[PDB]
Amino acid sequence: FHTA
Amino acid sequence: ATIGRISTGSKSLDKLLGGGIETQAITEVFGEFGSGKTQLAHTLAVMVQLPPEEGGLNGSAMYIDTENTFRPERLREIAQNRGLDPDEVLDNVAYARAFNSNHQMLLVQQAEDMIKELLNTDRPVKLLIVDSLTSHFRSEYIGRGALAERQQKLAKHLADLHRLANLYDIAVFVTNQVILAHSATLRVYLRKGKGGKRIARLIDAPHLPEGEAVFSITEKGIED
Ligand SMILES: [Ca+2]
Q: Report resolution in angstroms.
A: 1.8
CA distance B40 to B49: 15
* CATH number of the domain residue B208 falls in: 3.40.50.300
| Technique used | X-ray
Q: In the 8-state DSSP scheme, what is residue B194?
A: G
Classify B54 as helix, strand or coil.
helix
Classify B65 as helix, strand or coil.
strand
- The domain total for chain B is 1
Chain B CB contacts of A1 below 8 Å? 62-63, 94-96, 107, 110-111, 114
Q: To probe the interface with A, which of B77, B93, B114, B129 has the most A CB atoms within 10 Å?
A: B93
Q: What angle do CA B202, B219, B178 make, to 5 degrees?
A: 35
Identity of the residue numbered B129: I
Question: Strand order of the sheet with strand B25-30?
Answer: A2-3, B93-97, B60-65, B125-131, B171-176, B25-30, B186-192, B198-203, B212-218, B221-223
Q: What angle do CA A4, B55, B185 make, to 5 degrees?
A: 80
The two beta strands, B60-65 and B25-30, are unpaired
Candidate from B94, B107, B110 with C-beta closest to A3: B94
Identity of the residue numbered B113: D
Classify B134 as helix, strand or coil.
coil
Of B29, B18, B25, B50, the C-alpha closest to B203 is: B29
| Start-to-end C-alpha separation, chain B | 31
Range of the domain at B93: 1-224
CA distance B57 to B92: 13
CA distances from B102 to B108, B136, B157, B210 (A): 10, 9, 10, 38
